[PDB]
Amino acid sequence: GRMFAPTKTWRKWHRRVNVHLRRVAVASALAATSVPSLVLARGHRIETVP
Amino acid sequence: TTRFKKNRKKRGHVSAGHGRVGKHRKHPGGRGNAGGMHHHRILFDKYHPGYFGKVGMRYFHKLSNRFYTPTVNVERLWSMVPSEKAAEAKAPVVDVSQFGYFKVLGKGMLPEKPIVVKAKLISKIAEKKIKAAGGAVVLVA
Amino acid sequence: GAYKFVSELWRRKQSDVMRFVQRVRCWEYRQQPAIVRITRPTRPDRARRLGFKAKQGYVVYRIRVRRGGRKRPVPKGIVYGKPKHQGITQLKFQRNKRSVAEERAGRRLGGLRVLNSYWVNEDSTYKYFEVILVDVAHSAVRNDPRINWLCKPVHKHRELRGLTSAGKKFRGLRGKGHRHHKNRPSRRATWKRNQTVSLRRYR
Amino acid sequence: VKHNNVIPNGHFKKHWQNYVKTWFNQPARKQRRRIARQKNAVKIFPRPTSGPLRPIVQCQTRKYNMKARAGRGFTLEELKSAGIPKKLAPTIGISVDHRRKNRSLEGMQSNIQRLKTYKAKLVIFPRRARKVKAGDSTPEELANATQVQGDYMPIARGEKRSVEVVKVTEEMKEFKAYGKLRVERMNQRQLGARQKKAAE
Amino acid sequence: SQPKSGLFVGINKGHVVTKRELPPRPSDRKGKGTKRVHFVRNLIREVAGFAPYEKRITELLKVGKDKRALKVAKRKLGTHKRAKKKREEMSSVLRKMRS
RNA sequence: GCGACCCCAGGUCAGGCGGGACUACCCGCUGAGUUUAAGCAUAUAAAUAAGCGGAGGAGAAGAAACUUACAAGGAUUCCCCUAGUAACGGCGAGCGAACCGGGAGCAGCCCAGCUUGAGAAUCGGGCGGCUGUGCCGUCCGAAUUGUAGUCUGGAGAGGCGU
RNA sequence: CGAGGCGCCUCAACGAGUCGGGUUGUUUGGGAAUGCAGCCCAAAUCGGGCGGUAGACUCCGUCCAAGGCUAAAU
RNA sequence: UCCGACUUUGUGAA
Numbered sequence A: 001g002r003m004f005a006p007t008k009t010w011r012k013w014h015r016r017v018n019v020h021l022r023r024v025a026v027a028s029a030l031a032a033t034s035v036p037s038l039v040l041a042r043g044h045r046i047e048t049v050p
Numbered sequence B: 001t002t003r004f005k006k007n008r009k010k011r012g013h014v015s016a017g018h019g020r021v022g023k024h025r026k027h028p029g030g031r032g033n034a035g036g037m038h039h040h041r042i043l044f045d046k047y048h049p050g051y052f053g054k055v056g057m058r059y060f061h062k063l064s065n066r067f068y069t070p071t072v073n074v075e076r077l078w079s080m081v082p083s084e085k086a087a088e089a090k091a092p093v094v095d096v097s098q099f100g101y102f103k104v105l106g107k108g109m110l111p112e113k114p115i116v117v118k119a120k121l122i123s124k125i126a127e128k129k130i131k132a133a134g135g136a137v138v139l140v141a
Numbered sequence C: 001g002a003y004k005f006v007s008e009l010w011r012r013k014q015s016d017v018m019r020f021v022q023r024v025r026c027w028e029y030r031q032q033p034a035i036v037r038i039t040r041p042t043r044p045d046r047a048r049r050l051g052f053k054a055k056q057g058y059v060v061y062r063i064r065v066r067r068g069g070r071k072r073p074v075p076k077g078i079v080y081g082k083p084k085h086q087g088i089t090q091l092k093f094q095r096n097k098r099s100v101a102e103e104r105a106g107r108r109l110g111g112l113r114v115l116n117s118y119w120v121n122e123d124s125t126y127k128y129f130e131v132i133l134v135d136v137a138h139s140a141v142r143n144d145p146r147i148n149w150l151c152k153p154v155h156k157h158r159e160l161r162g163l164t165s166a167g168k169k170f171r172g173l174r175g176k177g178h179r180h181h182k183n184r185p186s187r188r189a190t191w192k193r194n195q196t197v198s199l200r201r202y203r
Numbered sequence D: 001v002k003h004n005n006v007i008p009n010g011h012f013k014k015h016w017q018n019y020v021k022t023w024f025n026q027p028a029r030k031q032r033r034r035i036a037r038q039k040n041a042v043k044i045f046p047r048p049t050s051g052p053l054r055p056i057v058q059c060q061t062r063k064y065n066m067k068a069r070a071g072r073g074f075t076l077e078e079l080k081s082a083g084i085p086k087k088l089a090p091t092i093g094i095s096v097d098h099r100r101k102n103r104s105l106e107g108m109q110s111n112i113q114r115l116k117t118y119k120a121k122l123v124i125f126p127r128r129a130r131k132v133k134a135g136d137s138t139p140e141e142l143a144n145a146t147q148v149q150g151d152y153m154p155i156a157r158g159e160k161r162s163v164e165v166v167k168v169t170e171e172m173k174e175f176k177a178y179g180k181l182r183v184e185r186m187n188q189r190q191l192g193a194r195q196k197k198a199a200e
Numbered sequence E: 001s002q003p004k005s006g007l008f009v010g011i012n013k014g015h016v017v018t019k020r021e022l023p024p025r026p027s028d029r030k031g032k033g034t035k036r037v038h039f040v041r042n043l044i045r046e047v048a049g050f051a052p053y054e055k056r057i058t059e060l061l062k063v064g065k066d067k068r069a070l071k072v073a074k075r076k077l078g079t080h081k082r083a084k085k086k087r088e089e090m091s092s093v094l095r096k097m098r099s
Numbered sequence F: 001g002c003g004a005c006c007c008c009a010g011g012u013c014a015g016g017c018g019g020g021a022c023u024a025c026c027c028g029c030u031g032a033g034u035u036u037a038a039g040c041a042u043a044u045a046a047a048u049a050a051g052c053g054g055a056g057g058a059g060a061a062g063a064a065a066c067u068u069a070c071a072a073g074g075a076u077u078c079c080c081c082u083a084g085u086a087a088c089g090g091c092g093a094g095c096g097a098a099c100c101g102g103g104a105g106c107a108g109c110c111c112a113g114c115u116u117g118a119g120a121a122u123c124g125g126g127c128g129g130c131u132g133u134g135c136c137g138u139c140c141g142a143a144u145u146g147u148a149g150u151c152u153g154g155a156g157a158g159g160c161g162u
Numbered sequence G: 001c002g003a004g005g006c007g008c009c010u011c012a013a014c015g016a017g018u019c020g021g022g023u024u025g026u027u028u029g030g031g032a033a034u035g036c037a038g039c040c041c042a043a044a045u046c047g048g049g050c051g052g053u054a055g056a057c058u059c060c061g062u063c064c065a066a067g068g069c070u071a072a073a074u
Numbered sequence H: 001u002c003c004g005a006c007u008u009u010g011u012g013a014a
C-alpha cells in the first residue's frame, strides 16, 4: 500500500540561526578550549601538555 | 519534533484525546470560514466586529509610493546631532531627509537649546516646540 | 515609385473602382478550391512589407476559410455540467481567421514554411487570404542572409505555435506594458509562475 | 473556527503540491554562476569584469526621488558633449541609451564628467601592430594594463549626512513654516475656482 | 521649461534642477504631411471618389446641418475626435469646390 | 497559319523538401466534473485533468504606439520585495496581479516604402575547370507586376571641410 | 609577411478591412468593460496610441502599432 | 425551430 504520511521533499531540512547568536556560540566555545578541566571532560588526553 | 508530541503520550489510550462521544470527524461545522453568518455568527460578531459589509470608496491602481511619508518626532532630533557638533554649538542644522524622514511631528520634549530643522513637512506643534526652544525650521524639497 | 499609388488605392475599399474589381475577383475565387497556388501576389505592395520577394523560393497560396463563430461540436447541443458551461452557439474561436488560413496552408504544404499572410477578400461566408511560404531547401533562400533564419530548425511550423504575425495578434503580443504583461513569455508561463509555492531552504 | 484567532486565508485550494519549488540547487547555482564569471573574465582578459560604464540617474517616484543609482546607458547628448561618437562608445566599453533624455542640467553635467573621468582611465589597444589609429595608447601604457574587479567607478546613494553649525537669525525665526505649508495647499485647491472667476 | 518651487506642496511642489531645452528628435515629425504623399493621396482621391457615408456627410453640410453631420460621422467612425476631423475634411472639400 | 503572353493539365522528367517516434522542461488550441460554499444555480475546483497539435537543447519573450507624476526612469527573462496588498467576489465562500526598489545577466539589429537608367549593377541551374562547406568560366533561365545596393525615426538624403 | 566618423545648413516618404468604435461570447485582479475572438461600422497624416471612472472643452507628460531576427541570466 | 435587422446584394423604370 501507501505509507501513512509519505515523506515529501519540502520538509524543513535547513535551520536558520541569527548571525549574532552564532558568533556568541563560537566565542563561548572558544573560551571553553582554554580551561583544561573542560578539555579533559571531553576525553582529550592532555596530561603532558605544557 | 516527534518525541515531544502529545500523541506519543496517548499511545494505548483509545480515542487519542478526542472523546468517545464527540469523536474526531472530518469537518463538523464546515470548511474554513463557512457559516460565518449562520452558525458561526456569534464567533464572528464577538471576535471580529466589522467583518462583513462595505465602507469607503475604491482606489483603482493605488500605488503605495504615492503615500510614502516617513515621520520623526522632535524628541529624537538631537540624537542625530553628533557630540562634537553639540559642543561647538549657534544651532546645529539637521536635514531629516538625509536620515530618511519626510514630516516632523511634535511628541516629546526638546532640550532648551536652539536647533534648525530642515524638512519637507512639519506639524504645527512641532514647529511651536522648535521655536520655543530658540530654533527655526527651513522647508526643503 | 508606384507602390504608394497602389497602397493608397487599396485604402479606398468603398470606391466604385475597388468594389467592382473586388466583386469580380470574389466570384472567381468562389469557383476554385479552398487552397490554390497562384503565380504572383494579387497585392504586391502589401506583400513587400510582409517580407515577400520576387525570387525563386517564395511561393504564394490563396486560402479560403469559413466565416462566423465556433459552434460547440457536442452530439446534440447537450452538455453534462453546470449551466455556466451549457452554451452552444454564440461561442468564439480564440484564434483569428488569418491564422486559421495560414495554418491550413502549413498542414497542406509540409515541405514549405509560412512567412505570413494578408487579407484578400470576403463576401458573407468566406474570407480569402494569401499566404507567403518559403522553400527553405532552395539555394536562393539558403544563400540570402535576410531569409536564412527561416532555414533553422527552431522555425519549424511556426504557424502551428502561434509565431507568425497573425499568431502574435491572438496571443496578446500586439501590445506592451500593463494590459499585456500577462501574455509574456506566455499566459500559461505567467500562470505557472504565479502558482509556484517557493519553499526556500532558509525560511 | 473555534477561538479568538485571525480569520484564516490559506491559498491552498488548488493542486499546489504539483507546483512546489525547492531550493536544494541553491549552492549549485552559486557555483555555476561563479564558474561562468571566471570563464567570462578569461575571455576578456584586460577588459573590466564589471561590464561597460554606466551613468548616474535619480530613481523615479517620490519614495526614491533622492537616491542615485546606475542607469542603462548614456544619452546621445551626453556622448556628444564629451566628444565620443555614439558608434564608438559600445566598442570601448560605454553603454548607450537612446531612450533617455536630459531634462535638467545638473544630471547631464555629472554624467558628462563621468565620461571624462572614464576616458582618462581607459587604455586602448591598437587593432594591429602598427598604431596608425588615433585613439590608441603608448606602448608603455599597454605594457602595464591589468584587469580590474568590482566597481571601478562607484555610485553614491543619497546625500551624505552633514550637520552644520549656523547662527539663527531673526528672519530664520518667525518664518511660520506650518502657515506656509497650509497657505500653499490652499492656493493649490483654490486655483480652479480662481481661474473660473478670472475667465468670467 | 519652468523650474519647480522647492516646497513639496503647492502649485509647482518640487525640487529645483535648472531645466534645459530638449533637442528635436526625428519622432517629433510623426504624422506630418510632407509632400508627394499628399500628392499621391490627392490623386487617388479623384480616381477613387468618395465613400457613400462621406457623401451623406457632404449633403448634410450643403444644407447647413452641421450637427447632423457630426452625428453621422460619429455613427460611422465611432469616435468624436475622428468625427470632428472627418467633418472638417468634408467641409474643406466643399470649400475648395466653392472656388 | 506562323507567333507572343496568361491561366491551367500530364510526367517513374533532373535535382530536392515533408509525413512518424519520444515526455521531464517549452509553444498553440480545446476543455470538465468530483470538491468548497456545511443546501445550491453565479463563484470555487480551473483559464486545471483529460482531448488535438508543434519544437529545441532549451523554448518562448524581447529593443516601448512602456511606465509614471518623479530631481523622473528606459528591451526581454528569472529571483527577492512589493503582497495575501490595489482590485475582484451570492463583496459570501474566497480570490488576487502590477509599478517603484534590490539582485542575476546584459546587446542590439534587418527590412518595405522616394532613392541604377550612362546600361539587373541581383539570383538559380546545367556543363567545364580549380586552390573545393566554396571560387572562376560558359550557356540557359528567374526577375522590371522589381533582384541588388542606399535608408529604418536613435534617423536619413543632399551641400560644404578634417 | 570608396565608404564611415566628426563640424556646419534645405527636403525628410515610416507598414489598412489595419487601427479605432459598437455589439456578442469568453477570459482577467482590471472595476461604464484586462486580453482575445466572431459579426457590423470603418480611419487619419498641423496625425495616431496612452496617462487604470464613462463624457465634452482647454493645457500638459509620454510613445509611434498594424513587417522580421536576436545571446545571457531561467 | 419561427420571426426581424445587417451581410451576401447588383442593374433600371413609373
Ligand SMILES: [K+]
Pocket (backbone or CB within 6 Å): B016, B017, B018
Ligand atoms: K484533546
Ligand SMILES: [K+]
Pocket (backbone or CB within 6 Å): D003, D004, D005
Ligand atoms: K487563539
Ligand SMILES: [K+]
Pocket (backbone or CB within 6 Å): D021, D022, D023, D024, D025
Ligand atoms: K530548484
Ligand SMILES: [K+]
Pocket (backbone or CB within 6 Å): none
Ligand atoms: K554557373
Ligand SMILES: [K+]
Pocket (backbone or CB within 6 Å): F152, G014
Ligand atoms: K520610412
Ligand SMILES: [K+]
Pocket (backbone or CB within 6 Å): G033
Ligand atoms: K470583454
Ligand SMILES: [K+]
Pocket (backbone or CB within 6 Å): none
Ligand atoms: K498625443
Ligand SMILES: [Mg+2]
Pocket (backbone or CB within 6 Å): B015, B019, B020, B021, B023
Ligand atoms: Mg470512538
Ligand SMILES: [Mg+2]
Pocket (backbone or CB within 6 Å): B022, B023, B028
Ligand atoms: Mg465534536
Ligand SMILES: [Mg+2]
Pocket (backbone or CB within 6 Å): B021, B022
Ligand atoms: Mg452528541
Ligand SMILES: [Mg+2]
Pocket (backbone or CB within 6 Å): D013, D014, D015, F045
Ligand atoms: Mg483542487
Ligand SMILES: [Mg+2]
Pocket (backbone or CB within 6 Å): F013
Ligand atoms: Mg525524377
Ligand SMILES: [Mg+2]
Pocket (backbone or CB within 6 Å): none
Ligand atoms: Mg511530427
Ligand SMILES: [Mg+2]
Pocket (backbone or CB within 6 Å): F037
Ligand atoms: Mg456543497
Ligand SMILES: [Mg+2]
Pocket (backbone or CB within 6 Å): F038
Ligand atoms: Mg458537505
Ligand SMILES: [Mg+2]
Pocket (backbone or CB within 6 Å): none
Ligand atoms: Mg449536493
